[PDB]
Every structure is written in C-alpha cells, then in structure tokens.
Design a protein around this ligand. Structure first.
Ligand SMILES: Nc1nc2c(ncn2[C@@H]2O[C@H](COP(=O)(O)OP(=O)(O)O)[C@@H](O)[C@H]2O)c(=O)[nH]1
Lengths: 133, 37, 126, 387, 375
RNA sequence: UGCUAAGUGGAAAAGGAUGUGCAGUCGCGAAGACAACCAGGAGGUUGGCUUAGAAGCAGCCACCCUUGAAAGAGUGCGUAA
C-alpha cells in the first residue's frame, strides 16, 4: 500500500515517483498514464493518491483531496510558509476563505458541521504562521 | 560486558539487580550488560 | 480523571437516561475507531452512542428507574440512547452487528421495563 | 543408457511436487534395486542456489527407468522456473505440463508454454492431475481440448502423449493409479526423443589464445564444444573480423602430444597452415565449413538481474548500450525494446532486439550474458537471427 | 576585483552560482617556470583567438555582440600573464557584462584552458583542490621545535618553541655524565609530550589531514607514537627534514604528501573494484548519471583525463549518450559533461574524488566513472 | 534493649547502587489504585522551515482543531525517506 502526493498531471517523471512505485514491482508507465487521465482538469492543484498493490503485481488506486496546507498557501499568494511561526507571519486569510477550503475538504474531514470544520483548517494555518481574520 | 565503578541503565529496558554481592545491569540489548568492579 | 471529574461524568450519564426514550446496551471490544465512525454516522439521525465505566454507570443508573439493569454492566459496555422512535436505530445496529460480528447486544429498556436481546431484534422487524 | 534431462512445469498449486513424488515412489517400487524414492519434503524444500549471483530455488531428483537415465527438476515458485529456464546452466530436452483438471490452464501455464517455446526446449507433453477429484468426462474433455489448442498454437507437438492421472491417490498407495504413473514412465520413454550427441554435431571451437612457438607456428587453442576434428580437414575461421578465412589443419596438439583427431571437451591445440597470429584472435570460431555464419543483428529473450543479486538499480530504455558476451568475448550492442514497452526494471524478463557493431557467430538457442561496467547485469538466449 | 584566498569547496560552489547575461569566460594559465613561459602564453592567446573565430563564425546578433565583448576584453589576457603573485597556476573568471574578474593563484600546476559558458568552469579547480589538501609539519630537535602548515604547495610557518626543560647543571652538585643524560632524557620526553599536544590542538583547529613528523635518528618514532588514536594513523615519518632550507623542505613535504595521496587513491580504486558485484557501487556513465539524478551518490569517482560526453534533459537531468527517458524529450547534447556531473554531485552534497588514472587499469570497463550508492 | 552479615569490626576519594533499621511530609485508591492479561491507540497531515531525502522520531519554529473512551504536532526501536 503506497501513499504519496503527485502533481496534478505530471506523474510521468520517474525519480520522485518511479523508485517509490517500483519497490513493489508496479510498472510505472502504466500507472502514470491512468493517473494522468483521471486527474487532468485539476491542473495547478497538487493531489495525493492511495495506491493499493495486489499479490500479483496488479494495482488499484483511490484519489484524494489537495492538502489543507497547500490550499492555504495559494489562498494567500505566498510561495512558502514561515520558518518561525508565532513570530513572523507571512500573510493573512479572511475567515471566509477558511470556510471555502474546509468545504472542498468536507469529504475527508471529521467534522459533521461547517463550524467545527473551519476550526480544523484554522489550526493548520497556525502551523505555518498565517493569520486568520 | 562493561566493568566500571559506575553502572547505570543506558536504555529504558535495563534493570539494575544485585547478584552475589555485585551491582549489575541486565537488558535485552547485549551492549548494555555491565557489572560493577 | 480524579474524584472531581468522576462527579462531573456521573452527572452526564444521569440525564442521558431521563432525556432518552429508550436505551440499548452493547459491547465493542475489537472495533477500530474507523469502524465506530460507521456506526455513529449510520445512527446519527436517530440515536447517540457512548461508552462509560461499568461501575460508574451503576452509580448514575441509581438516579433513574432502571434498577433492573445492573447485571448487564459487566465486561466492555457501550450503551446507545435513542432520542427518536425505536425501529430506526434498532435496524441500523442489527444490520451493523450482523456484518462485523464483533458487536454484541446485551439487552435493552423500553416501556419502563428491562428487555432481552431476542425482544430487541423483533423491534426492528415491527 | 543415455541420460536425459526433463522437468516439471505448470501453474503453481497443481501438484508438480506431488507428481514428482508419485514418479519417484513408482520408479522405486518397480525397481527397488535401481531407483530410490525421494521424500515429499525434499521436493517441497528446495535448497537455494546463487550461481553467477542469480538466486534460484530448485529441487533435483534422478531416477533410471528401463530405457535411459532421467533427470528431474522441480522448483517452488514461478520466478524460479523463469530464471532457471532463461539463464539455463543445464537445459531440459522435454518437459511435462502438470495441468490439474480442476481449473485447466491459468496465465502461468501460458507463460511457461511461451518460455518453453522461447529458450528452445523441443518436446512437451501433458499430464492432467487430480483426475480422481474430477468425475465429469466433459471437464477432462474440455481441458484436453484447451491444452491441445494451447500447445498447437505455440508450434509445439500437436500430438503430445496426453495422459490422465491422479498424483495424490497414486502417491498415497492406491493401485488404481500406479498404473497411470508407470504409463507416464513408458510414455516418456517412448516420447522425449533422444538428444543428438555432442560429438555427432559438426565441429565448432571458440578461439581462446594464439600462442606462437618455434618450429611449429601459431597454435590456436580452445576447448572443442561440439564435434570432432581430423587432420587435413578443411575448416573456416569465422568471427569478429569482417572477412571469413578458409584454411586446413596440419596437426592437432594435446598436452604437447600430437594426434590425428580431437573430439569434444578436449583442450586441443589446432595448428593451421598459412595462418599467422594477425589472422586469428580470441572470439573467432573455427567451424566445419558452411555450418555456421556470422551475424550482427538478432532478437533474444533476457532476464535482467536485480539490485540484490548485483545487477543494476535503475531501468534502461531504448538505445541502452551494454556489452554482450558470447562464447569467449563481448561486443557492444544497441538495444531496442518491443513496442508497448519503453523501460525495463531490474528483475524482469523481456524480449529485446540487439544490433551489434562487430559480426559474430550465433544460432538459435545460444546463451549470452549482458555485462556492464565489468559485471553481469543479465542473461538470456538467442531466439531469432534477423540478419 | 576579487583576488580570492583560502579556496575550499564552499567557495567554489558559491562561485559556480555566479551568472551573466551574455556569458562567462574561464581562463586557466600554466605558469610553471620549468616549461617555457612564452610557449604557454602563446598557446593561451591562440586558444583565445580561436574562441573569437568560433564565435564570429555564427554571425547572429547575439553571437555578434558577444564576439564584440570578446574583443573588448583582450588586454585582460596580459593581466593573467603578469600575475599578482608568483603562483605556478593561475585562474581568472571574467564576466562579459560586468567588470567582475575573479582572480586566483596557487602553486599546484594547471593546464592551459579557455572556456566560455553561462558560468564559471570550476571542474579543473576542483581537481586542484583535490591534489592540495592541507597538512601539518613538525620538525623537532634537541634544541627547539618548529611547526609549519603545507597547503596547495605553499609552506606557511606557524610557530617555534624552545626547550623549556633544559638547563646546564654546571657541575655544581656532583655531576656525572649519567645524571646529565638522565635529566636530559626526562626533559626531552616532557618536551615531546608538550609539542605533540600543541600539534594535536593545531590539527583539530585548522583541519589538518596528515602530519609529517621529523625528529631525527633518535627522536622520530617516540614523537609519532605520542599522537593519539584519532591521529596516529595519519602521521608520516621522515628523519631528515632538519637542516633543510625552505625550498628543499617544501619539495620533500610535497613529494611525501603526493605519494600518500596516490596511495589513498589506489586504495579507493581497489575498494570500488571489490564492492562491485554486490550491487553497492554504480559503475559506468549511464548508471552513475541515473544515481546522480536520484541523488543516491555518496561518493563520485571519475577520471579527469577522460573526455566525457552526454545529454542534458529539459528538466536539468543527465543521461548517457542515446538513452533518454520516455517521458522526457528535447534532450540537448552536452559535450563537456564532466562539469555537469560535478555540478550535480555538488548540488546533492556528495564527495568528489577525481582519480588521476582510473580508466586505464581498474575501472576500464566502466570508462573510469563510478559512484557509491547511498542505498 | 536494639543494630550489623560485611570477619564490617581489624585502612582510603570523587562517585555508583531495589542492602537493611527508625522517624517525618505528600500523591493515588473499593468511584477498583500499582503489576499483569484482552481491545482501541484516529482524521486534517507527509504541521511550517531546512535538506539530496526529513513523512511523530538529524536539526530549527510553533504544538492547534476535530470524532471521541482516549489517542502526544508524539516515549522508544527501526528505514536512505
Ligand atoms: N485432489 C487432488 N489434489 C492434489 C493431487 N495432487 C496434489 N494435490 C494437492 O494439490 C497441492 C499441489 O501443490 P504443488 O503444486 O505440488 O506444490 P508445488 O509443486 O511445490 O507448487 C498439494 O498440496 C496436494 O495436496 C491430486 O491428484 N488430486
């Protein structure tokens, strides 16, 4: 069972993805074709996938949602987060933007309500030193 | 086997016991085995 | 959970019976936390599922007229309070219990009387 | 009694080990003086081999029937069969396909048929297993038809002596099936044509050194592989140089002692006439004329070593340019993968098309190694001489 | 503008990052007096003029203006011939837009070279740094001790100590030869201890790799045996360094360190030969480049004499000649591939060991290039 | 009336240690404390930075939220990750 994050439609290159996918014997160029076809309209969003490998080299995969950490980074426009959070804060994010990111992650979070879901995303922004306003 | 005047539990699995008038440390890791002398 | 916390927890279980139409008692040993999320999401529209210390329930069970259900608080115990109707939650648990086989029902309490496992099964088919 | 190699192939969990056990028991019961039974565990506990670095698990068992000594090879897993059939230190002359009647062929059986056609084992015959547990005649009929078509399509013996046997009951001690096991024995003795002897094949010698001594002249030396040589027998030097040379022997040295003929396996000392050291070098072959031809392109089926065994650590792509090692020397050669493939991970077996840069002798079934950086990174067989 | 000193791999790595809009020209001048200086100067000017001709032959706008820049910087050639110091090997990197001319001089010999790329040519400079690692020299006498440093063929004095446990008894209290000899031996023993302590401290401070100890016919082995376990395996012994002037001292120390460096390189080649076949060493250009792409190379060994060529991908990757990854395309060809290999190895943090003669005997099949995989 | 098990008595330091006797403070516990056995020990997420790589577990900064019986931006071992 392989869990890793791949760019939206740039799975073809091997060295980041190939060797990690080759340990279990899965042939690379077959996966990089199937994955790229499934995730093409979402260009610009890094998207992870759970890869399941069966005993006979045959594999199946299930897609996921782009990371909460990555969605906040582009919602503010900053390239990289702060190296010393709680001291130097790279950007600010309105509470409206937070509830949008919590909405697109709703299929992968614990919270039943949108109120508690937004708090989950707000805690992540505290990790990279992004103010929530 | 380490033979030093000071013996101590290097890891969290070592135990300090007392055999035949000696202080000893016994673990599952053979590097940590040591007696006092 | 010191003495003060035990007094707080025992108060919560006291009101659970009073505000609930009925209760169903089960055990959960072997259910992964992900497997529990299946049951609570299935029961979310109808009932609430909690667990509590076997002894600490009995002290809280003395504040409600449920004095006939002391024998069922042995071993691991998980109790479900049904707030809306009875069949809706019973069918969901009965379906869930058949598959996993690690969920076992010990009894129930409806119409102010203790109830057996074989009787709770028929409530789903009612 | 001409000893002959065979082995079991077929999908895993079809009684290959069990059928070997039955054969051993029956041949020992018929000839307790001659054949000795092998225990089931020894069949199912294959000792590990690491020859040339390649890891294999094989079980070797031997027994003599009334006709000729037999050698029997059985391995636990499919990977062992692929590796052993490809690399092939000792190649079998005929194989038995243990297709159980419960479910007929599965892809593993198809690939065993494919590899058997590839490396060049000539003869194949079937032996349906678990005939006891299957009662319906229609099942065995359909399985027989399917296997017959599978064999015929792969250009094998369309009239293989198919036999129906229950291995488990026969091994247990049931006399109802010891007859079937011994009829396998007699079918194998009738079938599996006897191999041609090495001394019978035409002459062929790989050149190794060009020692030059006083009073005699250049002495091309190399262990004769196939055939026998005679003085005043015209021969051909064919190999890496562009042009073939035609010559004649003038004596055959062995151990400083002259002879008139040299048979296979003899560390001979051919002493040709009108030949100087500048005209022969290691890699060329001395052959009986016309028998063999040089080539620069071909197609083979190789098995690429893994990192653990000591091969590469990364795949290769088109125009991969390793050293190909035949006989006594290696020449570079560009590789082209088949269509529908553009990378070969280590530990995989695959067909490739090779284009060398210096002509060299070959024929279908020749064994060659792949060397890179000075170490072995693969092995295989030759399967088609394109040009 | 920048006559840099104290050259190490950090400075070389940072210097390779410098870039220009048109290009950067790298010049390596062989100022060795033994070979005729005029011949080397004429060869350097010839190579410069040939570069001018090759750039002129294109005739395109960018090529024309960069050629004009080439003939603008002609006098700088002479500025290399009359170097600032008396080094035996000179290097100058000139930017074709800015005025920045990075200058460096050392005593390690070099070969004439004129290159024009998008940045400095640091490869032969890495070889120079390989052949000139620092070392310490300790010359001990019954009267005093002398501590020096050797780096890049240049011998710097560090310190001089005089015998602190020495005095003349002057026959005041029943002196005999035996008592005077005993006193002298004890004093000399303590002096060896003190000098060894000082040299060990200097070694741990300045990062010395080897030490050349010279005590004489009597006091050379005790000095070697004083050094501790971390250092006693890296001490060379020469018994006649005292009484030599600076020229002879530098010559002897350089010869000894060169012998030791060649020995170490041979041992490295033997290790690479032995480890191959276990899968732990990537041999050959194709496998080495694939490992560098994955960032697995913990140690790169290459032959500076071989003229490696290869292909560079569209994402900065490296491939052997002909073999290109399926997804990748637009594979440019790089003819000076050795600089690319060294640059990638530096970018991944590996160790560079250019072995002078690896592709002749041991790694002949691999064409002189090998790497030690991290996993 | 007690203490010592070392022949201490009938030599010695920094320091190491579940030897043993006496006295005095405090935590936890029949709401089940301590030891042991059965089952959970999760999601955002591979937190941010740095790094060839750094995913609880070279290193630096923070150390939130949710479902919950509880589950640490992680107490060890382990892998190049
Ligand atoms: N019903 C039936 N079962 C068999 C017969 N022969 C073998 N088997 C069973 O099928 C299994 C086949 O295993 P096998 O293929 O011999 O293992 P391998 O040869 O090591 O791959 C064995 O465990 C036997 O118990 C048979 O004739 N009839």
């Amino acid at each position: 069972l392989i869990k890793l994050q791949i760019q939206a439609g740039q799975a073809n290159p091997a060295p980041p993805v190939g060797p990690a996918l080759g340990q279990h014997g899965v042939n690379i160029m077959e996966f990089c074709k199937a994955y790229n076809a499934a995730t093409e309209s979402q260009r610009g969003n890094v998207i992870p996938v759970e890869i399941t490998v069966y005993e006979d080299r045959s594999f199946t995969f299930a897609l996921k949602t782009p990371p909460a950490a990555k969605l906040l980074l582009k919602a503010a426009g900053v390239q990289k987060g702060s190296g010393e959070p709680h001291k130097t804060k790279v950007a600010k994010v309105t509470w409206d933007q937070v509830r949008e990111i919590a909405e697109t992650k709703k299929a992968d979070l614990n919270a039943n309500d949108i109120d508690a879901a937004a708090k989950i995303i707000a805690g992540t922004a505290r990790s990279m030193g992004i103010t929530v306003e | 086997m380490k033979v030093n005047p000071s013996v101590k539990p290097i890891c969290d699995k070592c135990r300090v016991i007392r055999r035949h008038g000696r202080v000893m440390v016994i673990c599952s890791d053979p590097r940590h085995k040591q007696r006092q002398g | 959970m010191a003495k003060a916390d035990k007094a707080t927890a025992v108060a919560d279980i006291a009101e659970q019976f009073k505000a609930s139409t009925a209760t169903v008692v089960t055990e959960y040993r072997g259910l992964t936390v992900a497997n529990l999320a299946e049951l609570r999401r299935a029961l979310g529209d109808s009932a609430t599922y909690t667990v509590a210390k076997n002894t600490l329930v009995k002290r809280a069970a003395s504040e409600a007229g449920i004095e006939g259900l002391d024998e069922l608080f042995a071993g691991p115990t998980a109790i479900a309070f049904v707030k809306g109707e009875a069949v809706d939650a019973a069918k969901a648990i009965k379906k869930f219990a058949k598959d996993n086989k690690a969920l076992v029902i010990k009894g129930g309490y409806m119409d102010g009387k203790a109830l057996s496992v074989a009787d709770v099964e028929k409530i789903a088919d009612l | 009694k001409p000893h002959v190699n065979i082995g079991t192939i077929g999908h895993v969990d079809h009684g290959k080990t069990t059928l070997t056990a039955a054969i051993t028991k029956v041949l020992h019961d018929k000839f307790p003086d001659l054949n000795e039974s092998r225990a089931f565990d020894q069949i199912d506990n294959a000792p590990e081999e690491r020859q040339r670095g390649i890891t294999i698990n094989i079980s070797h068992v031997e027994y003599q029937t009334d006709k000729r000594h037999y050698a029997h090879v059985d391995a636990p897993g499919h990977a062992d069969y692929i590796k052993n059939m490809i690399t092939g230190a000792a190649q079998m002359d005929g194989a038995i396909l243990v297709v159980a009647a419960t479910d007929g062929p599965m892809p593993q059986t198809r690939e065993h048929v494919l590899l058997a056609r590839q490396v060049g084992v000539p003869y194949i015959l079937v032996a349906l297993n678990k005939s006891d547990a299957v009662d319906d005649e229609e099942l065995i009929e359909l399985v027989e038809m399917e296997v017959r078509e599978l064999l015929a399509a792969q250009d094998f013996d369309e009239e293989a002596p198919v036999v129906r046997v229950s291995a488990l009951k026969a091994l247990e001690g049931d006399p109802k099936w010891v007859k079937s096991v011994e009829e396998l024995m007699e079918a194998v003795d009738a079938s599996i044509p006897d191999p041609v002897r090495e001394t019978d094949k035409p002459f062929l010698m790989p050149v190794e050194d060009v020692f030059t001594i006083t009073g005699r002249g250049t002495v091309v030396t190399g262990r004769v592989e196939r055939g026998v040589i005679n003085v005043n027998e015209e021969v051909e030097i064919v190999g890496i140089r562009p042009e073939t040379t035609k010559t004649t022997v003038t004596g055959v040295e062995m151990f400083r002692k002259l002879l008139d003929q040299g048979q296979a396996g003899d560390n001979v000392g051919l002493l040709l006439r009108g030949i100087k050291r500048e005209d022969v070098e290691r890699g060329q072959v001395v052959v009986k004329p016309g028998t063999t031809t040089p080539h620069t392109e071909f197609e083979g089926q190789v098995y690429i070593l893994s990192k653990d065994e000591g091969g590469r650590h990364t795949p290769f792509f088109n125009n991969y340019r390793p050293q190909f090692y035949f006989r006594t020397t290696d020449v570079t050669g560009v590789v082209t993968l088949p269509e529908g493939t553009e990378m070969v991970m280590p530990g995989d077996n695959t067909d490739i098309s090779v284009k060398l840069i210096q002509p060299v002798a070959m024929d279908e079934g020749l064994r060659f190694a792949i060397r890179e950086g000075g170490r072995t990174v693969g092995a295989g067989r030759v399967t088609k001489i394109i040009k | 503008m920048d006559v840099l000193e104290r050259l190490d791999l950090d400075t070389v790595r940072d210097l390779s990052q410098r870039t220009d809009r048109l290009g950067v020209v790298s010049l390596y001048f062989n100022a060795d007096p033994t070979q005729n200086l005029q011949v080397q100067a004429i060869d350097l000017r010839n190579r410069y003029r040939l570069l001018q001709r090759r750039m002129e032959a294109d005739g395109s706008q960018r090529y024309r203006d960069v050629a004009a820049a080439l003939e603008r910087r002609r006098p700088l050639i002479e500025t290399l011939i009359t170097g600032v110091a008396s080094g035996r090997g000179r290097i100058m990197f000139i930017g074709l837009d800015g005025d920045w001319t990075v200058h460096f001089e050392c005593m390690m010999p070099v070969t004439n070279r004129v290159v024009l790329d998008d940045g400095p040519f640091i490869h032969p400079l890495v070889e120079v740094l390989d052949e000139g690692r620092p070392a310490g020299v300790v010359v001990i006498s019954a009267d005093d001790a002398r501590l020096l440093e050797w780096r890049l063929g240049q011998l710097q004095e560090i310190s001089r100590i005089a015998q602190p446990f020495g005095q003349a008894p002057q026959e005041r209290a029943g002196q005999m030869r035996e008592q005077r000899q005993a006193r002298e031996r004890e004093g000399m023993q303590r002096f060896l201890t003190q000098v060894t302590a000082t040299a060990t401290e200097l070694a741990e401070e300045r990062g010395w790799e080897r030490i050349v100890v010279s005590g004489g016919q009597r006091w050379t082995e005790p000095a070697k045996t004083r050094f501790g376990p971390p250092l006693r395996g890296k001490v060379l012994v020469d018994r006649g360094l005292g009484g030599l002037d600076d020229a002879a001292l530098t010559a002897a120390v350089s010869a000894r360190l060169h012998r030791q460096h060649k020995y170490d390189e041979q041992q490295l080649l033997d290790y690479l030969c032995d480890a191959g076949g276990t899968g732990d060493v990537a041999l050959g250009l194709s496998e080495v480049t694939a490992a560098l792409n994955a960032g697995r190379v913990d140690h790169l060994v290459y032959d500076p004499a071989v003229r490696y060529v290869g292909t560079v991908g569209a994402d900065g990757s490296l491939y052997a000649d002909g073999e290109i990854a399926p997804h990748s395309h637009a594979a440019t060809k790089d003819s000076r591939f050795t600089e690319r290999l060294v640059d990638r190895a530096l970018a991944t943090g590996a160790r560079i060991s250019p072995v002078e003669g690896a592709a002749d005997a041991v790694l002949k099949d691999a064409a002189g290039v090998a790497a030690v995989l991290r996993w």
